[PDB]
Design a protein around this ligand. Structure first.
Ligand code: A3J
Ligand code: A3J
Ligand code: CL
Lengths: 296, 301
């Protein structure tokens, strides 16, 4: 088990870099434009690859010239596309990303093409013996739970030595996804999902939502400039201060850089404290760079 | 391939990739929202004119700046989809192929635009010097880099001087942006298009006021054309006769985006076909009117 699998989205991010965020009905002119391979799992993959970890992407892709750019990006990164669930009905999703240069804030206007999501069926044809770790980006909850149950089942039939570690990301404040809370050894819950539940801090969110996690699972919550916090079976709250760059220029994919760096550090067998710190470290380095090149 | 001699209408100007999103509410900074619909459209004045000329049944070619890439690839395949000849493109070593982001609010209809970057250089007089003019019957220039286009226009004038009247290249100019640098372009071309917005910024309040007020700026024998949306369009020749055509509005107005370009290309086409300035104004108004009740350019003819 040498690879890390990331199940989720691949999107074409059409990035416009603005000197100030536009006012409604205004006609701003951007400083620079760029095309970049997006989607949470696709970003985590980039980050993992840059960190030296052999990784594989699994997500739906619609053949076309857009997919040709995305696939070429994965291949240039060394991201294994073999497990890609190629669809026939639909187009590859795209998004319009306004990056405010003065603060690094990112505004994503997503076009979800209604492409069929990766199903338990697509997941059943996957050889789980090559994977050290598997990360699922919370989208089709009910169907992903079937992929999650399939991993638990494989793990029981395996020695503690060659067991697959699982991580789950709850990013959007969707009720269907709160069932995944749930599964996986490491559960990543976004600051957005936390505020949706009436939690005003990462520690509030952790203490409040730990009940919802599997026995032995680590619940992780990043809180932008406030750093990130973790809560494991011991009940001890772990915290990492952020690593902000002096000039924050691009936060697009920062949360993904966080996730992949926590998964990476924990995959390398480091403490949750060390992994929390490293997550913040790599996410913070990224926030001072455009794209993902230069974080290591 | 082999283009026959004096057969094409050339359009020199912008090509841009417009990514258009329709949203429930305008997105606030640092938010990940889902759009209702997303369109990737080929825009730009000379670009749009080419599309219309192709639909009208004219062999047409586009000359604009593009940088090799995936944005250029989408635009070149859209050009070809609309039968536009793309062999005159000034391919660039530095800069980004223009791409604009438009956010349309559902609840109020207001459009927020993130305009393309300055990075890509315009078509130059040295870029235009390389073109063998003989395959063109008409050359239309969208006013942008005025100093440089003036030399292009001087070049067409030079070419024309040494040709029989039956093989002389007719020329048109579009001054659409209210930029000072452009107003020198009035003195060039056989047909001069002035926009309602340019006319207003110069103090004019009607097509009549604009044509009578600016006809002095044109060269001897030129036609100065001004379309004023719902008020129709006027043309003014060297005879001093102010021509007019009323607008031909559609039953319900769908998309007005690119209708000025549809008008321009239709006036050019009609004049290129040997029709009169009055017959061309009319046709221009008819085609631009039909376009307004249609989404995109699909069935304008
Ligand atoms: C309000 C938007 C925003 C600003 C910002 N700044 C930083 C900085 F500390 F580096 F300056 C980080 C980082 N690391 C960060 N996020 C991105 C998601 C995250 C993993 O929770 C941390 C941020 N998010
Ligand atoms: C204020 C926005 C606007 C509405 C509108 N409606 C029409 C209609 F008459 F068809 F209803 C036309 C036309 N033809 C038109 N313009 C767009 C450029 C043009 C060549 O001057 C004509 C319009 N512009
Ligand atoms: Cl422009």
């Amino acid at each position: 088990g040498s690879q890390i699998l990331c199940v989720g989205l691949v999107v074409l991010d059409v990035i416009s870099l603005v000197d100030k965020y536009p006012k409604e009905d205004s006609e701003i002119r951007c400083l620079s434009q760029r095309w970049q391979r997006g989607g949470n799992a696709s970003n985590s993959c980039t980050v993992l690859s840059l960190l030296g970890a052999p990784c594989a992407f699994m997500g739906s892709m619609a053949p076309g010239h857009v997919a040709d750019f995305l696939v070429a990006d994965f291949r240039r990164r060394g991201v294994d596309v073999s497990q890609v669930a190629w669809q026939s009905k639909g187009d590859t999703p795209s998004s319009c990303c306004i990056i405010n240069n003065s603060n690094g804030n990112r505004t994503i206007v997503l076009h979800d093409t209604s492409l069929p999501d990766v199903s338990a069926t697509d997941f059943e044809k996957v050889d789980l013996t090559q994977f050290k770790w598997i990360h699922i980006e919370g989208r089709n909850a009910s169907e992903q739970v079937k992929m999650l149950q399939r991993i638990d089942a494989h793990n029981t039939r395996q020695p503690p030595e060659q067991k697959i570690r699982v991580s789950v990301e709850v990013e959007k404040p969707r009720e269907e996804l709160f069932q995944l809370f749930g599964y996986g050894d490491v559960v990543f819950v976004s600051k957005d999902v936390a505020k949706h539940l009436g939690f005003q801090s990462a520690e509030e969110a952790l203490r409040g939502l730990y009940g919802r996690v599997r026995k032995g699972a680590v619940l992780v919550c990043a809180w932008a400039e406030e750093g990130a916090d973790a809560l494991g079976p011991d009940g001890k709250l772990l915290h990492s201060d952020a690593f902000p760059p002096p000039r924050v220029v691009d936060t697009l994919g920062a949360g993904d850089t966080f996730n992949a760096s926590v998964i990476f550090s924990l995959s390398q067998g480091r403490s949750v404290q060390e992994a929390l710190r490293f997550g913040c470290q790599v996410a913070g380095k990224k926030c001072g760079l455009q794209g993902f090149d230069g974080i290591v």
